[model samples]
Target: GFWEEFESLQKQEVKNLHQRLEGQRPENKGKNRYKNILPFDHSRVILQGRDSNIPGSDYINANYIKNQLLKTYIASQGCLEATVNDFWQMAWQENSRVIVMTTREVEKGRNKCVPYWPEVGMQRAYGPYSVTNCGEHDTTEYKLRTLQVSPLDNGDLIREIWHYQYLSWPDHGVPSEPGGVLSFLDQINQRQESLPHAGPIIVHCSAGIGRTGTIIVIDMLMENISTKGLDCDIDIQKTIQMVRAQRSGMVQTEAQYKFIYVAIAQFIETTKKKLEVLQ
Candidate 1:
C-alpha cells in the first residue's frame, strides 16, 4: 500500500514538476547565485532597507511557511561569499532568533556555505551587521552555537541567535536513517517553542531546495499529526506542491521524495511502539 501510494504520487508529481519547470522566473536575475536555482515568481522574500547601490540585496527567495498558532519558517539558502552580507541583513531585518543550517560549511571537499558567523570572541562584519560567536556546544549529530548579532550603527540594538548546524546530513543524499534528523528537528521545535514571540526560524542547505525542503516537509507533517491526530488527512502530496509553489525544485530529487515516506513511516512505527508500551 505504501509503495502504491508513493507510485501514484510520483506519477502525479511528474506533471506538476514539468509545469513548475515551465513557470516564469522572479525579477532581478543578476542577484541569483546560480542561474539554474531561481525562486518562483510569487513567494520570493523581498529584502527591505537596501539603498539604491546594492544589486542583489533585494533577492533571496526565502519563503515564509506559517499555519496559525505561531508556527513559521523562513526557508533560505546557504550564504554565498558575495551574498553573506545579504544573509545577515535578512536575519537582522527578519528578527529571526534561530537559524537551522542543514548543510556543512564544506561537503565532499567543496565549499557549500560561507562561514558567515564569527568564532569565539571574534566578530565578523557583514554590511552594518556585526556577528559575534559567544559560545558553542557540540553533540553527536549537530552543533549548537550561540551568536550575537547587532547593528554597527547602534551596538545596543543586539539580538542573540541560536545557530543549529546539523552535521549528519550528506550533500545530495538522504541520511542512512531518520532517527538523527528527527532528533535534531525535535530539539529545534523545543527551542523554538520556548522562545517568546521569536521570528521565523531561517533554514538553509546547499541549494536551499533539496534537503531544506525535506526538513520542512517532515516538520510540517509532524506538526499536523500533533495538532490534528494521525487519522487526519495528511496530504504529503499537497504539502510538497505548496512548498514548490513558493520556490522551485523543492524536495529536489525523487529519492528525497521517497525518503519522506520512509521517514514518516519509521516515525509512525516508533510512535506506535511507544504508545503500546504506555498502554
Candidate 2:
C-alpha cells in the first residue's frame, strides 16, 4: 500500500516547479550550488542585509519548512565557496542553534560542500559574524560539534550552536538502517530540549532537497506518531504533499519517499519491542 501510494505521487508534476525568477536574478545567480536546484520565489530565505535594495541582494538558496511540532526548519543547499558568508549570516541572523548536514564535503571525487567552519578550536569570520568550532566528538552515527557565534564587534556575549553531521548517510542512498538516524535525531532534540530556544534548525545537503527533505520529513513523521500514538491515522503521501506545497520538490525520489515509510515503520516496530520488554 505504501509503495502504491508513493508511485501515484510520482505521477504528479513535482519535476515541474517554479519559474526560476527569484534564483535566476543576476545578483543571486552565482549563489546557487546547482543551476537546476534553485528554490521557488516564495520559498527562498531572504537575507535582511543593509543592501537589501539590490535586485537579488536578499536571496539565499534556502527554504523554511514546518514540522508536526510546529518547529520551523530551514532547508538549505550546502555552501558554495561564494555563499559561505551568506550561510553563516543566515544562521547568525536567525539565531539558529542547530544545523543538520546530511551530506559530506566531497562525494565521488566531486566537491559537494566546502568546509564552511574553521578547524576545531579556531575562529573564522563569516560576513559580520565570528564563528568558532569549539570542539567535536565522534559517534558511530554522527559527529557533534560545539560552535560559538557572535558578532565580530561584540564580545560581551556569544551564542552556542550545535552542528550534527550524520556520517552514516551514503550519498545518493538511504542509510543502511534507521537506527543510527533515530539516535542522531534524539541527540538533536536532547540538545534543543535542554538548552534555551533559538530559531528554526537549518538543515542542508548538496542540493538541499533530496536528503535534506528526507531527514526533515522522517523526523516530522516520527514526531507526529510520537504525539498522536500508534493508533492515530497517518498518510505518507498527504504529509509529503503538504511539505511540497511549502517548498517545491521536497522528498526528491521515490526511493527517498519509500524510505520515509520504512523509517516510520521501523520506529513503530521499535516501540512495540519496548512495550514487550516493559509491562
Candidate 3:
C-alpha cells in the first residue's frame, strides 16, 4: 500500500515538476557548464563580496537549506577548476564548519570534482583565503580531515573546518546498500550536534542535486522520525516537495526517490529495534 501511494504521488509530483521547470526564469543559462543544470533564480545563494571585478568569484548559486529549527546546509555543485576559488570563498563567508562531499575526485575516469583542499601537510591559497590541512583520518566508508583557514593578507586566527568525503558513491546513482549511507549520515549527524552553534554544513555531489538531494531527504526524514515520530508525521512526499521548491531537480530520478523510501523504512526498523533493546 505504501509503495502504491508513493508511486502514484511521485508520478503526479514529477509531472508537476516538469511544468515548474518550464516556468523557471533564465539566470545563468549561458554561463553554466551544462546549459540544462542552471540553478533556480529564486533560491540561489549569492556570494558575499564587495568587489565585482574579481574573476571566477561571481555567480555561484549553492542553494541554502534553512528551516525554523535553525538547521542550515549549503547544497552546491562539485568544484570546477574555474569555480574552485569561489567554492572556498563561500565556505569562508558562510562560516561553514563542516563539508560533506559525496562524490569522488574521479568517477568512471572522468573529472567529477577538482582538488579543492590542500594536501595533508601542505597549504594553499584560494583567492584571499589560505587553507592548510592540519590532520586527517580515513575510515572505511569516508575520510575526515581537519583544515585551518585564514585570510592571506591579515594575520587572523584560523578557522577550523571539518571535511567529510564519502568515496563510495557512484555518479548519478544510489549506493548499493542503504546501510552505507545511513552509517555515513550517522557520523555526519553526530558531528553536526557536536558543533551545534557553528555555521551551515556544506554538502555537494557532481551537479549537486541527485545524491545531494537523496542525502538531504534521508537526513531530514531521520530528524523528523526522532522529533515527530516514525508514523504519519513523516511525509517523504512533502519533504521532497519542499526540497524541489528550493532547487529544481533535487532527488533527480525515480530510482533515487524509491531509494529514499526504502532507506527510511530500513532506518525506522533499525531504530525501533535499538529502542526495544534498550527498553
Over the stretch 1-279, how does candidate 1's per-residue lDDT look in tens digits? 999989998887555532322112444453455667766534556678786465454666466655432178878878877678778878888888989999999998988888888888898788988889999999999999999988999888888999999998887688888888888888999988888788888999977888998998888888887777667777788888887776777898887888888888887788778878999
lDDT of each candidate versus the true structure: 0.79, 0.83, 0.79
Model 3: runs farther than 4 Å from truth?
1-31, 53-57, 67-70
* Model 2, position 273: C-alpha lDDT score: 88
Flag clash pairs in model 3. none
In TM-score terms, candidate 2 sits at: 0.89
lDDT of 2 by residue, 1-279 (tens): 999999888766455455457888877778987778788766667787648666777888998888633367899999999999889888888879899999889987988888888889999888888889999999987888999998888975699899999876765788767888887887887776575668888999888888888888888877787778888777888778877776777889877887888888999999888988998
Clashing pairs in 2: none
State in Å the error of residue 180, model 1.
Answer: 0.3
What is the TM-score of candidate 3? Answer: 0.84
TM-score of each: 0.84, 0.89, 0.84
Which parts of model 1 have CA positions greater than 4 angstroms off? 1-30, 52-56, 67-70
TM-score of 1: 0.84
